[PDB]
Amino acid sequence: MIQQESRLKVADNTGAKEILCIRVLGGSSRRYAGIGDVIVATVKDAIPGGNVKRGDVVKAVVVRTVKERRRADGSYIKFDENAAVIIKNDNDPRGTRIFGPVGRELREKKFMKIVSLAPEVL
Amino acid sequence: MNTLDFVDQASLRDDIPTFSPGDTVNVHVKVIEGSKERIQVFKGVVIRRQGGGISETFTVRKESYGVGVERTFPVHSPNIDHIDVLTRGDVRRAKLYYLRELRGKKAKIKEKR
Amino acid sequence: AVPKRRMSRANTRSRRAQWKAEAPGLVTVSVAGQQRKVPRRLLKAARLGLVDLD
Amino acid sequence: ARKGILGTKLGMTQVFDENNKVVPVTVVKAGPNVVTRIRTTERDGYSAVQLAYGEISPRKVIKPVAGQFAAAGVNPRRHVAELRLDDEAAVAEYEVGQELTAEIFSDGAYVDVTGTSKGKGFAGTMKRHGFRGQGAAHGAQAVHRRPGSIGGCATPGRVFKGTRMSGRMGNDRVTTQNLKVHKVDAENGVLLIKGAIPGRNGGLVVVRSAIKRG
Amino acid sequence: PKPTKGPRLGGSSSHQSALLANLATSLFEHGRIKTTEPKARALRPYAEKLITHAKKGALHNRREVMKKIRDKDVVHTLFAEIGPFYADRNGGYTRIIKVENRKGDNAPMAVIELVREK
RNA sequence: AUGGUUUGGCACCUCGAUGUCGGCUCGUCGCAUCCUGGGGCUGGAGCAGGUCCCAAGGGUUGGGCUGUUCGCCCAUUAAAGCGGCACGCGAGCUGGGUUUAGAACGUCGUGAGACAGUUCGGUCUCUAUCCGCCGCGCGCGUCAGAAGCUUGAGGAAACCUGUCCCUAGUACGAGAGGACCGGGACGGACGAACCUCUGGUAUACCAGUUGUCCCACCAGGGGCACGGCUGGAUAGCCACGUUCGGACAGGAUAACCGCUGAAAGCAUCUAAGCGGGAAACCUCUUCCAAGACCAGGCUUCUCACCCUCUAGGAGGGAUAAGGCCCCCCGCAGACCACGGGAUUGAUAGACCAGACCUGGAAGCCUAGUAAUAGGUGCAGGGAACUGGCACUAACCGGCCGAAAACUUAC
Ligand SMILES: [Mg+2]
Ligand SMILES: [Mg+2]
Ligand SMILES: [Mg+2]
Ligand SMILES: [Mg+2]
Ligand SMILES: [Mg+2]
Ligand SMILES: [Mg+2]
Ligand SMILES: [Mg+2]
Ligand SMILES: [Mg+2]
Ligand SMILES: [Mg+2]
Ligand SMILES: [Mg+2]
Ligand SMILES: [Mg+2]
Ligand SMILES: [Mg+2]
Ligand SMILES: [Mg+2]
Ligand SMILES: [Mg+2]
Ligand SMILES: [Mg+2]
Ligand SMILES: [Mg+2]
Ligand SMILES: [Mg+2]
Ligand SMILES: [Mg+2]
Ligand SMILES: [Mg+2]
Ligand SMILES: [Mg+2]
Ligand SMILES: [Mg+2]
Ligand SMILES: [Mg+2]
Ligand SMILES: [Mg+2]
Ligand SMILES: [Mg+2]
Ligand SMILES: [Mg+2]
Ligand SMILES: [Mg+2]
Ligand SMILES: [Mg+2]
Ligand SMILES: [Mg+2]
Ligand SMILES: [Mg+2]
Ligand SMILES: [Mg+2]
Ligand SMILES: [Mg+2]
Ligand SMILES: [Mg+2]
Ligand SMILES: [Mg+2]
Ligand SMILES: [Mg+2]
Ligand SMILES: [Mg+2]
Ligand SMILES: [Mg+2]
Ligand SMILES: [Mg+2]
Ligand SMILES: [Mg+2]
Ligand SMILES: [Mg+2]
Ligand SMILES: [Mg+2]
Ligand SMILES: [Mg+2]
Ligand SMILES: [Mg+2]
Ligand SMILES: [Mg+2]
Ligand SMILES: [Mg+2]
Ligand SMILES: [Mg+2]
Ligand SMILES: [Mg+2]
Ligand SMILES: [Mg+2]
Ligand SMILES: [Mg+2]
Ligand SMILES: [Mg+2]
Ligand SMILES: [Mg+2]
């Protein structure tokens, strides 16, 4: 439920606050991006001395969305506002933490580091 | 007349603790990793029930860091290790729809006395 | 749009050929000593004796 | 072989797995079907079994239908519908007047359910064939939501039979293939299926062994 | 009842509510009333509702009927005569009978009346 | 040499009117194929290529820029095909420029004006007759008449694919790197279906609230002010929601690969024969389908009372099976059609019971001078949901609707 031109909160210690969704990767005319999808985002505003300055183009893995997300037992989970995470070719997050909860689907997605160092997984 | 009352019974789990929209609860998510099971902890706010024979249906949802989180699960959930409704509660209805937008000091779940 | 020409007499009348009225079968009721004509739509009221038939 | 059964949808529900998941399910009460005729190839032209199920007051049932049922030797049934066989092997195991029940299905066997679709009434093109709505502003003139261009121009100078445009949709036979079975009732003829089969509460649904997978 | 499916009778919720209130008022004030049968079928639910509410005579119930029909005369008559008058019978207090189609617009006409047999 | 697509030539059709570029919606076809499929060769170790052959089943980006087509750029995918179709499509829409009337700039002209130079704003009409097409009905014939069930000629629909693991870091390669065929799982877009979950909507549900008018007064309620504004949600409908699908297999083939083989002691995939061989064809899957006039097949019910004409055939009645109308109606529906029921009955509506929603009715009482709070209590109220209830409405029922035959074998 993350779309082109959608604002995203940053859930990492890079120095990013607001970013734009470039697209949803891995699909011809793919149209939505929910938690677990590797999507491409651009930095719109960032910390002055942060690790990445605005205008850079980086890939992100969406984690926190205002749209519910299913799970095996029919569980639907709503969050307060969409949140992404910055990542590069090796699929290693460019930050060293995460603020706010996260979703268990990342473990399935094999981004072990994120959920392993997350403050809490739900 | 829900001709499935008698097929519902064939799988309906006994000892159904009561739970009300707007109670504080916890759940356990039996998850397998490397062919191994485990138990975790989680808090939530059952927002709605939908009783259905064996289809009595509901979820849960918590708050943290100024944000919310849920879990949806059976009345007779074999995944919920125990539906430990923390403190019995009520709310303005049986279902908290406006809970998706209240922020700060607006969105909690009342505790009855 | 409009027509390109006159539609033949026969064509117009053929189109007309299925637009007509129909006649039903009436019903008599013996109430109050009199038999009046009412479509079965009314038969029970006819028997009871309150239907406004001249 | 290519067994078959009629049944009704009375609602639809979900069950909670021993696999520990949750699955939606539809209530297809499979009343006991009764064989009221045989289709022997040598004397009819093919192999198949006649089926009927239900209850109708004798005055509600036509005289010829009642006579046919009597000659069959079974009580009146609410409708009649017959399924086909694939070989005389299954044929030899069926016999006029025999009663058939939901027992015939062993769990884990994919199934196919088909029946009349919902009554949608006449439908606009956009809803029917999933068109896209035009620009509803920037100056549409009573054309916010209509089909639009319809073919070539003087070549082919026609409108190409088959073009998908407005036409009353729904309310026709439809089938859903490869639906996992979930629980077979025995005492009171009930059958639970994952998914959402077509039809309507109180509608008529015919189930049969799945074709694709098995 | 079940909702008036097509373009509803009058063409607005307020108009329907009013029209029906006045219709019921007239029906109880007179005891029999001739109108277009479709309006009769639509009205039947409201008259039956009011009769049931009259079934028991209390301050709450009469406030209810006042809010519903807004005519103190008809409320009084309903609660004083019809209410007790229909204690024994249970449901189906009115009877719909059709009459000749109206001349002005041919619209089907049906005479409606409360069951006066009991 | 081919095609007729670009720039062109001719002026044969149209000046008593053939609306023009783009965009939008919708598409349809060809194949000189973009990917997906199958092959030949490589300067083909492998991966990854290059090239040519068969193949049109399916699919084939979104944005910034400009009116743009185009093109560049950014970033994805397997790909971002080339074209024909009045440079597809204004009696389907837009008018952004082209293309009137004002004005202006530069330029040409003494000039009025002009400039396939630029710049700002500038009326887009039609109730579908016919063909056509998407659906739904009426009439008749199917050879006594009816209710059902079909077989199936014959049409239609669908046909896409990515990623990851195992074989295996093995064959291959010095190393770097990294196989083929084959399975399994999870994905994108697309389609069908559905309301269980999550949600949307919710105008007979409820409540809060401003103004006002009204109901004799107040207390309480109602009218109106986009529902007066708001917050909730029944059912139903629906998608973001969930289930499923694209096959497997088979037959005959393309290109291609072959075996045994003389013409021509050899050689030779071939002229005799026999084989393999792909999303291409025919079936397999689903839907329509006996108006299939070649009108099919299988059951069950009514299958004999007349008259007359002038006996040749025909005209006037009898009806049952069943149908129609009628009534109540449906999740069926534009009207029609279809489905259900019509007393020996649950079709509808009330009723009861419940669920559900709303969340604490009014009245009284108590505390507070009050605005209010609590009890009376899980209050009151309650559409479309679940079961039963003849209480009302659907009937002492009318009307349509029974066999010329000929020839042959047994
Ligand atoms: Mg649809
Ligand atoms: Mg649209
Ligand atoms: Mg206009
Ligand atoms: Mg408009
Ligand atoms: Mg010329
Ligand atoms: Mg000419
Ligand atoms: Mg001319
Ligand atoms: Mg002109
Ligand atoms: Mg034009
Ligand atoms: Mg043009
Ligand atoms: Mg070719
Ligand atoms: Mg290839
Ligand atoms: Mg090559
Ligand atoms: Mg091709
Ligand atoms: Mg195809
Ligand atoms: Mg073309
Ligand atoms: Mg053109
Ligand atoms: Mg075109
Ligand atoms: Mg063109
Ligand atoms: Mg037009
Ligand atoms: Mg036209
Ligand atoms: Mg112009
Ligand atoms: Mg101009
Ligand atoms: Mg000028
Ligand atoms: Mg000058
Ligand atoms: Mg000059
Ligand atoms: Mg202007
Ligand atoms: Mg114009
Ligand atoms: Mg016009
Ligand atoms: Mg016309
Ligand atoms: Mg065929
Ligand atoms: Mg919603
Ligand atoms: Mg909604
Ligand atoms: Mg309303
Ligand atoms: Mg007042
Ligand atoms: Mg007052
Ligand atoms: Mg009050
Ligand atoms: Mg008012
Ligand atoms: Mg208004
Ligand atoms: Mg509001
Ligand atoms: Mg819906
Ligand atoms: Mg040779
Ligand atoms: Mg050789
Ligand atoms: Mg026939
Ligand atoms: Mg009959
Ligand atoms: Mg509620
Ligand atoms: Mg109800
Ligand atoms: Mg009901
Ligand atoms: Mg007659
Ligand atoms: Mg003859």
Closest CA to B108 of B77, B68, B70: B68
Closest CA to B41 of B26, B53, B51, B60: B26
| Residue B112: CA count within 13 A, CB half-sphere | 12
CB pairs under 8 A between A and D: 8
The method of structure determination was cryo-EM
The span from the CA of D148 to the CA of D157, in Å, is 16
Q: Round to whole Å and give the CA distance between D46 and E12.
A: 61
PDB resolution in Å: 2.5
Using CB atoms within 10 Å of the CB of residue D57, give its burial: 0 to 12 exposed, 13 to 18 middle, 19+ buried.
Answer: exposed
Does at least one atom of strand F sit less than 7 Å from the CB of A23?
Answer: yes
Q: Where are the alpha helices (DSSP H) in chain A?
A: 105-109, 112-117
Contacts of residue A115, Cβ cutoff 8 Å, sequence gap at least 6: A102, A104, A106, A107, A121
CB E77 within 8 A of CB E85: no
D55 within 8 A of D69, measured Cβ to Cβ: no
Residue ranges and CATH numbers for the domains of chain A are 1-122 (2.40.150.20)
Residue D6, beta-bridge partner list: D206
Sheet of strand B49-50, all strands in order from the earlier edge strand to the far edge: B49-50, B57-64, B67-74
- Token pair for residue B1? 């007349």
| Exposure string for B23-37, b = 16+ CB within 10 A, e = fewer | bbbbbbbeeeeeeee
- Nearest CA among E106, E104, E95, E55 for reference residue E78: E55
Select from A18, A102, A80, A100 the least CA-distant residue to B103: A80
- The total number of residues shown for chain C amounts to 54
Bond prior to D156 in cis (omega within 30° of 0): yes
Whether the Cβ atoms of residue E1 and residue E45 lie closer than 8 Å to each other: yes
Question: Which among B10, B11, B74 has the least Cβ separation from residue D22?
Answer: B74
Length of chain D: 214
User: What is the residue-wise DSSP string for D86-119?
Assistant: SSHHHHHT--TT-EE-GGGPPTT--EEEEEE--B
Long-range contacts of D139-144 (CB under 8 A, 24+ apart): none
Concatenated DSSP letters for D22-88? Answer: EEEEEEEE-PPEEEEEEE-HHHHSS-EEEEEE----GGGS-HHHHHHHHHHTS---SEE--EE-SSH
d(CA C20, CA D145): 37
CB D206 within 8 Å of CB D6 = yes
| Cα torsion A34, A35, A38, A44: sign | positive
**Token pair of D73 as six digits:** 């030797």
Q: Which of D205, D203, D121, D113 is nearest to D170 (CA)?
A: D121
HSE-up of residue A10 (Cα within 13 Å, Cβ side): 28
Nucleotides of F under 7 A from a protein CB: 23-28, 59-62, 74-80, 85-95, 125-126, 128-130, 132-138, 146-152, 156-157, 162-163, 187-200, 203-204, 215-216, 220-225, 227-228, 231-233, 237-238, 240-247, 285-288, 297-301, 321-323, 325-334, 340-345, 348-352, 355-363, 378, 380-387, 389, 391-399
For D154 and F15, how far is CA from C1' in angstroms? Answer: 22
Distance of CA D57 to the CA centre of its chain: 25
Q: What are the φ/ψ torsions at residue C12 (nearest 5 degrees)?
A: -60, -45
Distance in Å from F192's C1' to A25's CA comes to: 28
DSSP run (H or E) holding B69: strand B67-74
Partners of residue B69 in chain A, C-beta under 8 Å: 77, 79, 101, 122
Number of other residues whose CB lies within 10 A of the CB of residue A2: 24
The amino acid at residue A108 is: E
The end-to-end CA distance of chain E, in Å, is 25
Rounded CA separation D46/B105 (Å): 75
* E98 chain-C contacts, CB cut-off 8 A: 41-42, 45
- Cα dihedral sign, A92-A93-A98-A103: negative
E79 touches strand F (CB under 7 A): no
| Residues ≥6 apart with Cβ < 8 Å to A46 | A14, A15, A16, A17, A52, A53, A54
Using the structure, give the distance in angstroms from the CA atom of D162 to the C1' atom of F395, rounded to a whole number: 51
| Segment holding E114, helix H or strand E | strand E109-114
Burial of A12 (0-12, 13-18, 19+ CB in 10 A): buried
- Could you tell me the CA-to-CA distances from A66 to A37, B106, D58, E68, E104 in Å, in that order? 15, 18, 60, 44, 61
In sequence order, what are the beta bridge partners of A20? A7, A42
Burial class of residue E91 (count of CB atoms within 10 Å of its CB; 0-12, 13-18, 19+): exposed
Strands (E) across chain A are located at: 7-10, 16-24, 38-46, 57-61, 83-84, 86-87
Sign of CA dihedral D34, D37, D39, D42: positive
DSSP annotation string for D154-189: SSS-S--TT-------B-SEEEEEEEPEEEE-SSS-
Instruction: Give Cα B113 to chain centroid, integer Å.
Output: 21
Question: Is D197 strand, coil or helix?
Answer: coil
User: Would you say A14 and A52 are in contact if contact means Cβ atoms under 8 Å apart?
Assistant: yes
Which residue is it, tokens 């990492």? A12
Nearest alpha carbon to residue A84 among A27, A33, A29: A33
Measure CA D25 to chain center.
16
Structure tokens at B103: 């922020």
Q: Alpha carbon of B95 to those of B58, B92, D112: distances in Å?
A: 10, 8, 37
Please give the Cα distance from A45 to C27 (Å, whole number).
Answer: 87
Interface test with D, best of A73, A75, A76 (most D CBs within 10 A): A73
- Dihedral-angle region of residue A114 (phi above 0 means left; psi in -120 to 50 means alpha; beta otherwise): alpha
For residues E72 and A44, what is the distance between their CA atoms, to the nearest angstrom? 69
Contact predicate A40/A57, CB 8 Å: yes
Coil/strand/helix, residue B6: helix
- C30: enclosing H helix or E strand: strand C28-31
**Are the C-beta atoms of residues B94 and B21 closer than 8 Å to each other?**
yes
Q: Which of residues 63-102 of D touch strand F (CB under 7 A)?
A: 63-68, 71, 79-82, 84
CA angle B83-B84-B88, nearest 5°?
110
